[PDB]
Description:
This is part of a larger assembly, with chains A, B, C, D and E. Chain B is of the alpha+beta class. Chain B has two helices and three strands. Chain B has helices at about 15-25, 40-50; strands at about 1-5, 35, 55. Helices cover about 0% and strands about 55% of the residues of chain E. Chain E contains no helices and four strands. Chain E has strands at about 1-10, 15-20, 30-35, 40-45. Chain E has a four-stranded antiparallel beta sheet with strand order 2-1-4-3, with no helix packed on it. Chain E: One of its GO terms (cellular component) is ribosome.
Amino acid sequence: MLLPKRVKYRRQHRPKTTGRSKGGNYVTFGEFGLQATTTSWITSRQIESARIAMTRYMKRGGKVWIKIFPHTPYTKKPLEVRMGAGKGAVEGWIAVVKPGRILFEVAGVSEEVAREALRLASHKLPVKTKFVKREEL
Amino acid sequence: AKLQITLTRSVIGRPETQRKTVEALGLKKTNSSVVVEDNPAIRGQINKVKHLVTVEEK
Amino acid sequence: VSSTKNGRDSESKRLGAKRADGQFVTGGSILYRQRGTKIYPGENVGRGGDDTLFAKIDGVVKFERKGRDKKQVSVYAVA
Amino acid sequence: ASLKSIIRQGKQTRSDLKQLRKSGKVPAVVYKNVSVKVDEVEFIKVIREVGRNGVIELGVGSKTIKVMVADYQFDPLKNQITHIDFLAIN
Amino acid sequence: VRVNVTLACTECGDRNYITTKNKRNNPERIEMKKYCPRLNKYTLHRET
RNA sequence: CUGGUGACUAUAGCAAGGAGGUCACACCUGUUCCCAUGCCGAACACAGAAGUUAAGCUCCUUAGCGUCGAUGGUAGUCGAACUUAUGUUCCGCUAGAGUAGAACGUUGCCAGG
RNA sequence: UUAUUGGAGGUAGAGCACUGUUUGGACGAUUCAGACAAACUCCGAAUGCCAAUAAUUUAACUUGGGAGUCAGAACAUGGGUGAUAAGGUCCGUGUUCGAAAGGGAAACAGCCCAGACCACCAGCUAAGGUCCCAAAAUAUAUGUUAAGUGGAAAAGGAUGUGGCGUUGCCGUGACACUGCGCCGAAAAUGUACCGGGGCUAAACAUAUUACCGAAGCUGUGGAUUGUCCG
RNA sequence: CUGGGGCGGUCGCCUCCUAAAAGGUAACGGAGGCGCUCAAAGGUUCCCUCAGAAUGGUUCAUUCAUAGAGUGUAA
RNA sequence: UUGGCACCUCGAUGUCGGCUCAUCGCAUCCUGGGGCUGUAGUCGGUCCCAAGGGUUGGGCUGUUCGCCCAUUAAAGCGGUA
Ligand SMILES: [K+]
Ligand SMILES: [K+]
Ligand SMILES: [K+]
Ligand SMILES: [Mg+2]
Ligand SMILES: [Mg+2]
Ligand SMILES: [Mg+2]
Ligand SMILES: [Mg+2]
Ligand SMILES: [Mg+2]
Ligand SMILES: [Mg+2]
Ligand SMILES: [Mg+2]
Ligand SMILES: [Mg+2]
Ligand SMILES: [Mg+2]
Ligand SMILES: [Mg+2]
Ligand SMILES: [Mg+2]
Ligand SMILES: [Mg+2]
Ligand SMILES: [Mg+2]
Ligand SMILES: [Mg+2]
Ligand SMILES: [Mg+2]
Ligand SMILES: [Mg+2]
Ligand SMILES: [Mg+2]
Ligand SMILES: [Mg+2]
Ligand SMILES: [Mg+2]
Ligand SMILES: [Mg+2]
Ligand SMILES: [Mg+2]
Ligand SMILES: [Mg+2]
Ligand SMILES: [Mg+2]
Ligand SMILES: [Mg+2]
Ligand SMILES: [Mg+2]
Ligand SMILES: [Mg+2]
Ligand SMILES: [Mg+2]
Ligand SMILES: [Mg+2]
Ligand SMILES: [Mg+2]
Ligand SMILES: [Mg+2]
Ligand SMILES: [Zn+2]
């Protein structure tokens, strides 16, 4: 599971999820990519499951770039407690994903093989995705 | 040269700044009207409350 | 149950601009409250012990550029 | 290698730009600076013919300026060219 | 460490100046020239 | 043209190449006098003039780094209508980034030529 | 209040020049590319605010007499907290209720329209509506849907069907986008979220011409209180 | 005080964020500090410029280095 | 269900289990119909339709629950303060 080695503040306000993707909207390292078309938090466990699906389908022969990182911690209260008495403890780490953002990139395989690997990864994610290639012209 | 302004929509439910502009225009009750000299300040007041008033040229 | 170790803040100090550019001020009028020289004293304007900028004469306040990355405030007699 | 551009007259509101892009045109600027608009399909064909850094004979109004593509704004969602800049080669 | 200090000069009973000092750093009776309103002049005021 | 001293957001800077020095500005010579070194005539200070453009400095050329920077479009957003959709529409304002490009300072006063 | 002009300030956005976080290269930590931030900023709006002198407008301030109030609520929006739970909770902003009747939303303080001095068996409109209940279009033109979708929901699945297209073969494949529908869809007294009847338009999307519709406005008479000129 | 009360925690002051680019702005929201110190660490005049790195030397020297140091103490 | 919230009720809305009497839902326990099966047969597994009727007598415990004894076609899960 990806997570920062350290952060300055462990308790953070949850990020704003309205709007469109600030950047990373293009394939820059690989040949094909998976582009989000809806918005969600993406957790490190979801990232790991999607990455495992992709790498298993391409037999660790091509190469994958994970374009998102879960920089943001989020807290959760302990079970069966009333409101108040301070913020809860860190539960996990999320990345903010908005329409346009490229989630994964792959290179070194055919278009059909990449499409299938990315479909398998997409079914592990809480967002709708589209197969994309590097933009030319 | 002259503009007739009619207060066509109510000020009930409108923000206080819009109400203040309505009053500064000289409008009093719904469907009341004023005749004013056309100039940029009057145009700006009208623009602020254009959704509440109807403007015609005399 | 638990408890929080936070919950402290000092009183707000009401800093910032106290008179407008182009406004007439009597001598001694405080023009700017600040920590450090966020704005510098210009013509006929003094800097207090707590960095307060105040007018040394009666006149009109002018906030102006001071170099590339600094600014200042002056007071010019109306005449 | 050729493409006709229609000059945009005056200011175009946000609604005007939206209607243009719906009807299938791409707003562009030629650089005197000229605001123009082209057809996305014909532009794609010319770019395919001449390459990215090729040379185009843009028919701006009555004249014909030899230009290239200095920059272009694209929309990865909807897969649409949204703006073009044509630098006159001189 | 730090204690309150009262300075009074010879030809006055005004005792109008109070100040502070570190007893460890300055074990002596500190002396200083201070203006004395009674005499309208500076005088040698010394810690009591 | 040089020099002093000001004003102006580095368009003024930095860097890389050339030309210059009679007066001037300098590097320079000395430590006897004013003065000076946690040590040193290095610097500061005073006396000067053998020497040299080598450097600082001035003029010419480079857009290389920095700096400035549109138009057009986009993000955002005041207001309005729809709406509950990680929203839509209209209107006004309008970035940041990036592009064309600008820029190897301009200029007041005084003195010298 | 608006117009113009000047100013203070660092939010939205953006960006990586600082701090911190992070992914691939290359090279002998540097460089290259690409990302993240309430307590990051090389940057930086819209607004809002403070002022100055024109248009419109009618307050504003001072001093005294007399209070009541210190349980607030919903809605919309900027945020914290909670779980991008609550008809939750705490702040900012606006409206309404409170203290507001009338029309609409079946009924429904807080939503939409709109502020009732009194009388009328006059008229025009607002939101919302015009087949019957129940006032007004079984209105007009073009198209979409066949699911009673309309008249409560997702990942995901699918030769449903309309409109744009890009291409391969020489009728027909593959592909992408978009409109409207389908499945996914199980609760407890009784049909049982269209309010009922009913509707294939009486649904939906554009465009148009009418009308209905309030205690809004207008018309007529009257009451009281104010100004200005009875 | 308290998302019933108790138990736990808190109670005054300072700095930051939340705070929506004037000011102000709440929660048992997110982070820290204070209840001093200094006889110079005050005043004034004069002079001076840092951290780091590389390169050589059994701290000393050179060059890059707008501060990436320091500013008694938290921001 | 355990909770979160504190909106009705503190000038009173009787709390658990059992008894009596039921009534409704279907995510069906039995019985009826059917597809697939790693369904030879007899038996089973799983899914679909189906709420008409049926769906126990004891030992222990206040118990709900649960375990056990002996049955049964079956000894279903929930709602109704
Ligand atoms: K950075
Ligand atoms: K509370
Ligand atoms: K604040
Ligand atoms: Mg980028
Ligand atoms: Mg001081
Ligand atoms: Mg002081
Ligand atoms: Mg932001
Ligand atoms: Mg509430
Ligand atoms: Mg809420
Ligand atoms: Mg509020
Ligand atoms: Mg009350
Ligand atoms: Mg009402
Ligand atoms: Mg009111
Ligand atoms: Mg309702
Ligand atoms: Mg009613
Ligand atoms: Mg009422
Ligand atoms: Mg009518
Ligand atoms: Mg009728
Ligand atoms: Mg339905
Ligand atoms: Mg019904
Ligand atoms: Mg109805
Ligand atoms: Mg009336
Ligand atoms: Mg408690
Ligand atoms: Mg503000
Ligand atoms: Mg503020
Ligand atoms: Mg403490
Ligand atoms: Mg203490
Ligand atoms: Mg409950
Ligand atoms: Mg409450
Ligand atoms: Mg009670
Ligand atoms: Mg009673
Ligand atoms: Mg069934
Ligand atoms: Mg017995
Ligand atoms: Zn004395």
